[PDB]
Design a protein around this ligand. Structure first.
Ligand SMILES: CC(C)(C)S(=O)(=O)c1cc2c(Nc3ccc4scnc4c3)ncnc2cc1OCCOP(=O)(O)O
Ligand SMILES: CC(C)(C)S(=O)(=O)c1cc2c(Nc3ccc4scnc4c3)ncnc2cc1OCCOP(=O)(O)O
Ligand SMILES: [Ca+2]
Lengths: 281, 284
């Protein structure tokens, strides 16, 4: 019956508070804890509403309960009449979205690192699904896979997460009008990691995406999207195709997904991961 | 308020249970059958005394409560009539002790990494001291500073730790702790700093540890000279000053970890980011 309380952080302890980004989830700022002498990230509201207050506390409780090696570590809650935010560790290398799509900043993203990121996303989500009761993330995207100083994964944005009791490109078609949601989002992420392409890039209207996916269309699998030189290409296409299956029942569990990925990750020597990171800006 | 429960891990979920080391308990590596991750298990030497049981659950609770970036992350408690242990993340690069003293395996341990390790030990301990009530480690040693895949620090062994409200080595113990304090950890930290910068065993020339205690109680400390600490150590003067104030005979004259961090922050900024990655690739 061992319990841990989430610390409360007085707002005045957050020095050098500097805006990072703004989204549907909230505003993100970087700061430094005055006493802990560490860099932190604060996901705050930035006009006060008590409905938004309950949302932030809900997210903070989920993150506190869901602590694991591949989940964004929550450091405390900053709860004041003036300000409200979730204080977490600062991820110096940002998101998987930027790593994949900022091609001038990152001309090369070595295969070992790409596969390690995919393994760690699967490890993080599997942990969530294995909790009592299971936690389902329900908003996985390359924007929510944060990367620490050594490009290790930290899953963020627990705003839509649910206890099993914006963009639509990662959403399973049955969700337009389930434990099998996250695996679908994961198959799209996998495709995106291996291609460095935006899913449905040639599609201008998101209603056209939604209609196509509802009819069984998926991001294109060919020589141009997934080149023949991808290590374990056949096996990876198989995983992607089972993950984004039209029938949710036919999509694998993250356990099955990990049992498949484990022999692939063992083909890479340990030093090749370190070498991949040192190559990166 | 927001509370988190420490998961309970059935023993049968720990596959490939292999012995790592034994000490004042036993540490084994395993893999979680459902989580598909490598874990470390600090368990009792396989007889189950109810006094030893309370000790494990006490440490498990301290580790759960003390979660931070530089503290060994607890994953769960394995509590069964058959077996009892603390399940944590596996630290693939072992301890600071091995890094420093396994000189054939590691001929060079670059200065940036050494300073980063010292910064992270100070960050970890400072966090403990800043809790309400403060947590005091009371058993810091190079054997208890574990190193992850990229040689980032994780402080372990909370067995002697306390809330400010048989064993081994005494070389990190302040002389006032000998016979029957918030200033204990800073003393252990000064010895660790000396050890990191020298790659030498404190009081190497002294065969008997009781002779060490007699020496320390008299005001003797590990030697500070050209041979122990060469003149080519980056920020040598500043570091000697930190070490000497940290292990002072008078506890009142020892700095807080905050003061220690405020001093170390400008030193760590002198090193370029790539030098930390380079230091780690050299060690592989
Ligand atoms: C995602 C991004 C790269 C556009 S960012 O917003 O600039 C960013 C976000 C961070 C974060 N976000 C967070 C914090 C708390 C919670 S509670 C649930 N979900 C969250 C998410 N957390 C940690 N570190 C972050 C770092 C970020 O960017 C890195 C800085 O980029 P740069 O200025 O280019 O060096
Ligand atoms: C310290 C060592 C290197 C001699 S080790 O014993 O081989 C070791 C220990 C680990 C650990 N210890 C632990 C576990 C749980 C608790 S609860 C409070 N304190 C602790 C401390 N935890 C995590 N990883 C460890 C890794 C260790 O070995 C390094 C790798 O050795 P090898 O497999 O031979 O390469
Ligand atoms: Ca070597």
């Amino acid at each position: 019956a061992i319990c841990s309380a989430l610390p409360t952080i007085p707002y005045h302890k957050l020095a050098d508070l500097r805006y990072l980004s703004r989204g549907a989830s909230g505003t993100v700022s970087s700061a430094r804890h005055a006493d802990w002498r560490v860099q932190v990230a604060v996901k705050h509201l930035h006009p006060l509403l008590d409905s938004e207050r309950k949302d932030v506390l809900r997210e903070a409780e989920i993150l506190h309960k869901a602590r694991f090696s591949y989940i964004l570590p929550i450091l405390g809650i900053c709860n004041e009449p003036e300000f409200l935010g979730i204080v977490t560790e600062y991820m110096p290398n940002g998101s998987l979205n930027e790593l994949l799509h900022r091609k001038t900043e990152y001309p090369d993203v070595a295969w070992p690192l790409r596969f390690r990121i995919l393994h760690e996303i699967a490890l993080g989500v599997n942990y969530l699904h294995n909790m009592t009761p299971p936690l389902l993330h329900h908003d996985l995207k390359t924007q929510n896979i944060l990367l620490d100083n050594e490009f290790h994964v930290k899953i963020a944005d627990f705003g839509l997460s649910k206890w099993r009791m914006g963009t639509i490109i990662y959403m399973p078609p049955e969700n337009y009008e389930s434990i099998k949601h996250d695996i679908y989002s994961y198959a799209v992420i996998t495709w995106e990691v291996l291609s460095r392409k935006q899913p449905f890039e040639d599609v201008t209207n998101p209603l056209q995406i939604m209609y196509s996916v509802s009819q069984g269309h998926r991001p294109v699998i060919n020589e141009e999207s997934l080149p023949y030189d991808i290590p374990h290409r056949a096996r990876m296409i198989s995983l992607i195709e089972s993950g984004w299956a039209q029938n949710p029942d036919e999509r694998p569990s993250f356990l099955k997904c990990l049992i498949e990925l484990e022999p692939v990750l063992r083909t890479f020597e340990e030093i090749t991961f370190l070498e991949a990171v040192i190559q990166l800006k």
